[PDB]
Each structure stands twice: as C-alpha cells, then as structure tokens.
Amino acid sequence: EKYCCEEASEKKCCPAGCKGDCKCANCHCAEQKQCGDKTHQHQG
C-alpha cells in the first residue's frame, strides 16, 4: 500500500507508492520486485 519506505513518502524515491518500475534503493525495487535474496532487512 503506497510507499513503504521511511523517506520516500512523496517523491524521494518513487512517485508515491512504487508504481512498479520505481527502481527504489532502500527497498530494492525493480519493476515490481520482491528482492530479499538471502532474507534482507525488508520489513513488510
């Protein structure tokens, strides 16, 4: 639901809620990705 980062709550990283191809850096997003290779710190 909308942004899930503690900084990208507007356009710091994505235009409000990673649409998909946001290419986040804190959550490691990529065209709607889940990331977390070896259990990352991703808390969602």
User: Rule CB under 5 A: which residues touch Zn ion?
Assistant: 3-4, 18, 22, 24, 27-29, 35, 40
Q: Which is nearer to Zn ion, 12 or 40 (CB)?
A: 40
* Nearest position to Zn ion, beta carbon: 29
CB atoms within 10 A of CB 25: 13
The closest of 38, 1, 44 to 26, measured between CA atoms, is 44
Q: Nearest approach, Cβ of 33 to Zn ion (angstroms)?
A: 8
Q: Nearest approach, Cβ of 39 to Zn ion (angstroms)?
A: 10
Measured distance CA(1)–CA(37) in Å, rounded: 22
